[PDB]
Design a protein around this nucleic acid. Structure first.
Ligand SMILES: Nc1ncnc2c1ncn2[C@@H]1O[C@H](COP(=O)(O)OP(=O)(O)OP(=O)(O)O)[C@@H](O)[C@H]1O
Ligand SMILES: Nc1ncnc2c1ncn2[C@@H]1O[C@H](COP(=O)(O)OP(=O)(O)O)[C@@H](O)[C@H]1O
Ligand SMILES: Nc1ncnc2c1ncn2[C@@H]1O[C@H](COP(=O)(O)OP(=O)(O)O)[C@@H](O)[C@H]1O
Ligand SMILES: [Mg+2]
Ligand SMILES: [Mg+2]
Ligand SMILES: [Mg+2]
Ligand SMILES: [Zn+2]
Ligand SMILES: [Zn+2]
Lengths: 46, 163, 649, 430
DNA sequence: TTTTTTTTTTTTTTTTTTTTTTTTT
DNA sequence: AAAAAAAAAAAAAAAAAAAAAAAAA
């Protein structure tokens, strides 16, 4: 849901803070998106 | 009021608390939850007449037990540091692949689970809190949860973050 | 005039005392303005006209004109302020000689003090000085009457004793009565004594200002005889007062250190934050716009994208219907209760919070216990006031307003019973301790809830995919089924919306036109208070035929039927829509729009197959005021979504 | 002089007319009935002598004493001839009322102290009737002399014993001191008048001889009294808790002509039809249901056989139907029309249980009876909506009550059988 | 002898724990 | 039939408001 957009924005902000950057580059957004996508796991079933 | 540290606790004994007393200048240098070193004098306070005395510490100075900086806004923190500490901080800021370096260093004993390490690292940093024009508060601190089978090193992640 | 040995002692001497007195009088007379000639002239005029017995004095101008007096002010506030009161009294008498009959006293209030501190920064160095702080009022007692000019009554010789002025530091002790020279007990003489209002508040540091690893601090303040009721709990207030210490406060009691309590003798209060005229013209000016309905429907919760139908329903709920009780035996509520049931992440709580913000007498509560006030009434000693009070349920507090209930599907059994009682009989009956009473709560309930299982499934009727019994749902006039369906265009639009909001509210940077919120609430007030539409122009033929057709269709299928209460709700919504336009007479278009909304809700409450059945069967009714572009876009979106599903399966 | 004011009050009481002298005859009838109190309309006093009313509004404390003394003397003058054993004249409490709109509790500032104030509120607690001494006698311990008839002030104003006839040799004789009724109440601001975000304010009411127990907690009341502070041997400094001296109470919400009206109404040939069509005129249809509800309202007759067994005479009605029919509306009308009636849901109501419960106060160890809808509705009607959604305890309780008319409850403290003679009108869906 | 501070007592309420009870698998 | 969660009992602690007695000067 949209709360995942909020989480992605926050994760991009944190990623930017990690490098002490002053503007959120697209690479930070990509990394946050990748991490959040990995956090989601498929519900496998027979 | 303070209480004994965990390292000093003898076997099977509750921590001891002695209410220290602070005076001018150093009257708010200690906040709840901080580990602090108090320098001063132990004294007796009375609590025909009866002489009932209680021990109380009178501190002439309070400082953090494990100072973070050897020397709140970005520049203020920068000046709070020493020359060598700032050299290190600036060097690691320019350190490409600092993400993996932080992940490994923060959790050296936990094998794999790269995603959880990255999550808790971003958690330690966090986002940017903001306030809306209508007054709505935009959450700027990320929470994390860990769920799975036992002996997957969850409580170990929690203990790493705490310590 | 820097001279002498001690500032307070310097003012204590009669010489400089009278010098300051006359200099301050001359400052009041002479300090005019940059352009507002003699601000104090009209100031005193207005104060006397309304009998305000007070004078707010800016510190900037006083320092500019008389720097010596301004410098002396903060050092010894008591004496300087008393001298200022004495001066202003005779100044007022000179301006208004008759006003001497009113309060025989004038208070001087000082504002815009240059140096402002914080409650955590207060130190002994600030004792006995005028200090300006800021904080949140965390507690405030009643307007207690404090002795001002006591006249004790000697018991032995029944002779009333002269006025012993009451001091805020020490309780007055009478001597021996002059007549029979007895040092007896004495008792107050209330009939001949004169009092002064005494309120006690607590001011705590604003949470937004406290640092990370620190807790907010609080200080007790005393408001005296004119600042009373100037604050209520939860107010952010700038308080300028004397950091008084010497009244009785000294822990001389055993097991105590020679500490001193501190209270701020309040001298000025400024709250940092609707009966107007000629705004009736404003409201009427755009009332004739002929499209104001769309404007207002688009001017609800401007921070929420889309959900136009929900916004329309909330507008109708805000303006409300017309309560009517034919004779006295058929109570029909004029409210329009609304229930927003939807899968999470759809801004339902945002709608509820907006309604909280925009509507007067609007209170917010949650199904969980995380709300300040609960749904159910009770009696207990209030934790802060320690007084035994009847805590009326939240619904009662919103007696004539709006009650917002979040997590409507997570209430207790007693909470469910209380909401049922309030929605059914518009009142609450209490028999808890000994209070056998029935107090009425005529609230409009706007509720938010999530479907059972965290996702709304259209294959199931509304009443079964929500953790609410049929009687509860039967009392809501509008049911908004908010569904989060994957849609790339809408997803992109909402992402742009929220990300732009985040960008624009960063700390560093801190088809009609919606009405401004303040004007919107002014319009709501005027409409809700003045215009009372009467449905003398409703087409009974059309409504009756529509109801009969809906009955036949709903019973033709195994679906929830239409009942009389639906006609009631349509009537209420038509009256509300008329109220929006202030018509005073429901018009055919109002009735058609109300029918549109009611049928939309009733259809969306049905299962998937019945949804299409009633859509096609009553598409004419459901398409009123719905231009061709909207329907065509909906159909194109349906077709392209079908194509997408075929592609990706 | 004060004697002149009392004389003027006497003239007002003896000669105020409306012809007929209202207050003279009221004194006659009340004293003959033993009431020994009167209700003085403030507007009549103001019209007859406006100065007296203004004095009352400005100095109630002693002017009301003067009025009471004048009323006592007038009552003697109108009812002096009495049989032996009661000829002693009786003081008269003078309650006063007025049509002036009440002032919000928020306007009771310090200035209004000792003025006559009219405020609205809701009484949330009433203390038990007790004894306050109006005339006490003190006897010296050493000389055993007496100082009978020591006038005692009204209100929460104690009294200090004399020190000199040893020193402080006096003690009170309980058997010789005259006292009167006494009661303290808690008045909360009406919830409607409370500002939106704001706590409700409070006040303490003090009743007197005949004002005690004229109200019960939960009543919506208008109080006209003397804003007064406690007088008990004299960071807040010099703060005296304030209270109202209650003088007039008005509780907000059959003549023979009406008895004859009922007699002729019953005699009508179609009285049943007019009653049937006169219960839910707004509701359409259901004539048989309306007739049945009228029958339930009138009820049968309770019979107690010579053996002592009781046959209930109260009809119980149930209505099962689709949720569309106006049956909850019907229950609301029934509760609004029955002489004694209460509406409630299956699971009781909002903080008002269905059936009575008994609990013992651990501190005071009393037997507090928290009354449910059934016991409150004794002798009347209980309209239970959603009657099919009761709780097991309540289901059993109503199981017993609807037939026996009594709720039997036995707790760790005591056994008892509360009398709940209520007619149940139940609504339900399939 | 006369004040004063303490002493109690007498109510009342509040909080933690335990136990008892109700609902679900 | 048995376990999990909730509710109520009950006991201990705190506030406190007021009346009486012992110690002090
Ligand atoms: N239509 C929308 N327009 C703008 N912002 C939206 C919209 N829908 C959701 N959001 C945003 O997405 C987030 C989730 O919304 P919100 O927290 O109000 O959820 P909700 O509907 O109340 O959910 P729940 O039922 O879980 O409480 C918020 O930050 C909100 O601002
Ligand atoms: N991937 C791993 N790498 C290193 N140690 C691990 C790993 N998984 C489990 N362990 C070890 O297993 C032990 C128990 O794990 P623990 O965190 O207590 O399990 P749980 O998450 O159920 O509490 C820990 O002391 C940890 O050292
Ligand atoms: N026969 C009728 N005559 C008048 N009004 C009716 C009739 N039937 C239903 N209504 C209206 O329909 C609404 C639903 O009635 P209600 O008693 O609430 O149903 P329920 O008892 O099932 O809750 C009521 O507001 C009532 O005014
Ligand atoms: Mg574990
Ligand atoms: Mg929500
Ligand atoms: Mg019903
Ligand atoms: Zn005297
Ligand atoms: Zn004697």
């Amino acid at each position: 849901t949209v709360r995942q957009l909020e989480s992605m924005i926050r994760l991009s902000e944190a990623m930017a803070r990690m490098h002490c950057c002053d503007e959120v580059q697209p690479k930070h957004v990509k990394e946050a998106f990748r991490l959040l996508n990995k956090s989601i796991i498929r519900v496998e079933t027979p | 009021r303070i209480q004994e540290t965990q390292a000093e606790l003898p076997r099977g004994s509750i921590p001891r608390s002695l209410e220290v007393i602070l005076r001018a200048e150093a009257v708010e240098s200690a906040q709840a939850g901080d580990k602090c070193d108090f320098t001063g004098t132990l004294i007796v306070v009375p609590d025909v007449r009866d002489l009932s005395y209680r021990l109380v510490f009178l501190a002439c100075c309070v400082a953090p037990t494990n100072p973070r900086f050897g020397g709140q806004t970005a520049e203020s923190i920068k000046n709070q540091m020493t020359v060598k500490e700032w050299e290190k901080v600036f060097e690691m800021s320019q350190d490409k692949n600092l993400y993996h370096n932080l992940c490994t260093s923060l959790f050296p004993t936990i094998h794999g689970n790269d995603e959880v390490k990255r999550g808790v690292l971003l958690m330690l940093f966090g986002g940017v809190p903001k306030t809306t024009g209508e007054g709505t508060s935009l959450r700027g601190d990320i929470n994390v949860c860990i769920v799975g089978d036992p002996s997957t090193a969850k409580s170990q992640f929690l203990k790493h973050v705490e310590e | 005039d820097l001279k002498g040995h001690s500032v307070r002692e310097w003012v204590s001497m009669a010489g400089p005392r009278l010098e300051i007195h006359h200099r301050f009088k001359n400052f009041l007379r002479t300090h005019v303005d940059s352009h507002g000639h003699n601000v104090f002239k009209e100031r005193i005029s207005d104060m006397c006209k309304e009998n305000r017995e007070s004078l707010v004095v800016n510190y900037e101008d006083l320092a500019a004109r008389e720097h010596v007096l301004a410098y002396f002010l903060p050092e010894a506030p008591a004496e300087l302020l008393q001298i200022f009161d004495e001066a202003a009294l005779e100044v007022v008498l000179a301006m208004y000689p008759k006003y001497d009959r009113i309060t025989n006293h004038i208070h001087v209030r000082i504002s815009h003090l240059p140096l402002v501190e914080e409650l955590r920064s207060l130190r002994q160095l600030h004792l006995n000085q005028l200090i300006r702080t800021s904080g949140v009022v965390t507690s405030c007692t009643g307007v207690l009457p404090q002795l001002s000019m006591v006249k004790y009554n000697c018991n032995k010789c029944n002779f009333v004793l002269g006025p012993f002025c009451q001091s805020q530091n020490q309780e007055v002790k009478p001597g021996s009565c002059p007549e029979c020279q007895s040092a007896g007990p004495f008792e107050v003489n209330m009939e001949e004594t004169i009092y002064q209002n005494y309120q006690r508040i607590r001011i705590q540091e604003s949470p937004g200002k406290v640092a990370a690893g620190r807790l907010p601090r609080s200080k007790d303040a005393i408001l005296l005889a004119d600042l009373v009721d100037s604050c209520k709990p939860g107010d952010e207030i700038e308080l300028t007062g004397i950091y008084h210490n010497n009244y009785d406060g000294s822990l001389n009691t055993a097991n105590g250190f020679p500490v001193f309590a501190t209270v701020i003798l309040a001298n000025h209060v400024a709250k940092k934050d609707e009966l107007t005229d000629e705004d009736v013209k404003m409201i009427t000016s755009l009332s004739k716009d002929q499209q104001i309905g769309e404007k207002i429907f688009a001017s609800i919760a401007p921070s929420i994208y889309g959900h136009e139908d929900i916004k329309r329903g909330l507008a109708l709920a805000l303006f409300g219907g017309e309560p009517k009780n034919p004779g006295g035996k058929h109570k029909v509520r004029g409210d329009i209760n609304v229930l927003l049931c939807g899968d999470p992440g759809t801004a339902k709580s945002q709608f509820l919070k907006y309604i909280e913000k925009v509507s007067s007498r609007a209170i917010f509560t949650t199904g969980q216990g995380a709300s300040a006030v609960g749904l159910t009434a009770y009696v207990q000693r209030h934790p802060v006031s320690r007084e035994w009070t009847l805590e009326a349920g939240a619904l009662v507090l919103a007696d004539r307003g709006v009650c917002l209930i979040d997590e409507f599907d997570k209430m207790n059994d007693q909470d469910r019973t209380s909401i049922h009682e309030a929605m059914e009989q518009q009142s609450i009956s209490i028999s808890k301790a000994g209070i056998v009473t029935s107090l009425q709560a005529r609230c409009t309930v706007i509720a938010a809830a999530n479907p059972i299982g965290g996702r709304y499934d259209p294959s199931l009727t509304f009443s079964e995919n929500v953790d609410l019994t049929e009687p509860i749902i039967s009392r809501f006039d509008i049911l908004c089924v908010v569904r989060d369906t994957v849609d790339p265009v809408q997803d992109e639009m909402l992402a742009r919306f929220v990300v732009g909001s985040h960008v624009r509210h960063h700390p560093s940077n801190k088809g009609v036109e919606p009405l401004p919120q303040e004007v919107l609430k002014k319009y709501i007030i005027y409409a809700k208070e003045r215009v009372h539409p009467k449905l003398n122009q409703m087409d009974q033929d059309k409504v009756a035929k529509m109801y009969s057709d809906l009955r036949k269709e709903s019973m033709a299928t195994g679906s929830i039927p239409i009942t009389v209460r639906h006609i009631e709700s349509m009537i209420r919504m038509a009256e509300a829509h008329a109220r929006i336009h202030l018509r005073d007479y429901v018009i055919e278009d109002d009735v058609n729009m109300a029918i549109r909304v009611m049928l939309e809700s009733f259809i969306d409450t049905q299962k998937f197959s019945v949804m299409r059945s009633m859509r096609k069967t009553f598409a004419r009714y459901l398409s009123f005021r719905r231009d061709n572009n909207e329907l065509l876009l909906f159909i194109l979106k349906q077709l392209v979504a079908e194509q997408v599903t075929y592609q990706r399966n | 002089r004060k004697s002149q004011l009392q004389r003027r009050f006497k003239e007002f009481l003896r000669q105020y007319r409306v012809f007929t002298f209202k207050y003279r005859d009221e004194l006659k009838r009340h004293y003959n009935l033993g009431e020994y109190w009167i209700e003085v309309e403030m507007e009549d006093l103001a019209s007859f002598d406006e100065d007296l009313a203004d004095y009352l509004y400005k100095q109630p404390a002693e002017h009301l004493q003067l009025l009471e003394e004048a009323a006592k003397e007038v009552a003697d003058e109108v009812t002096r001839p009495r049989p032996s054993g009661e000829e002693v004249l009786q003081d008269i409490q003078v309650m006063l009322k007025s049509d002036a709109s009440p002032s919000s509790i928020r306007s009771l500032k310090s200035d209004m102290m000792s003025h006559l104030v009219k405020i609205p509120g809701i009484i949330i607690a009433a203390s038990a009737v007790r004894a306050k001494a109006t005339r006490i006698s003190i006897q010296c311990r050493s000389c055993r002399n007496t100082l009978t008839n020591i006038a005692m002030r009204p209100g929460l104003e104690g009294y200090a014993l004399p020190r000199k006839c040893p020193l402080d040799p006096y003690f009170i004789m309980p058997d010789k001191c005259k006292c009167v009724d006494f009661q303290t109440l808690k008045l909360q601001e009406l919830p409607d008048a409370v500002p939106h975000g704001e706590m409700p304010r409070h006040m303490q009411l003090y009743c007197d001889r005949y004002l005690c127990d004229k109200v019960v907690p939960g009543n919506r009341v208008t109080i006209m009294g003397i804003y007064s502070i406690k007088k008990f041997g004299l960071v807040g400094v010099g703060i005296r808790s304030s209270y109202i001296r209650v003088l007039g109470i008005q509780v907000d919400t059959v003549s023979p002509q009406e008895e004859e009206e009922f007699r002729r109404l019953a005699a009508l040939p179609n009285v049943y039809e007019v009653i049937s069509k006169s219960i839910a005129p707004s509701i359409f249809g259901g004539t048989d249901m309306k007739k049945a509800i009228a029958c339930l309202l009138f009820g049968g007759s309770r019979k107690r056989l010579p053996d002592g067994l009781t046959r209930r005479g109260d009809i119980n009605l149930l209505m099962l139907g689709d949720p569309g029919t106006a049956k909850s509306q019907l229950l609301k009308f029934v509760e609004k029309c029955s002489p004694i009636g209460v509406y409630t849901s299956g699971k009781g109501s909002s903080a008002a249980g269905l059936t009575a419960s008994v609990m013992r106060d651990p501190s005071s160890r009393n037997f507090i009876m928290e009354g449910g809808a059934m016991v409150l509705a004794d002798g009347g009607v209980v309209c239970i909506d959603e009657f099919d959604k009761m709780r097991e305890d309540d289901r059993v309780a109503i199981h017993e009550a609807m037939e026996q008319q009594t709720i039997s409850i036995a707790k760790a403290g005591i056994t008892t059988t509360l009398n709940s003679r209520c007619s149940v009108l139940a609504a339900a869906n399939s």
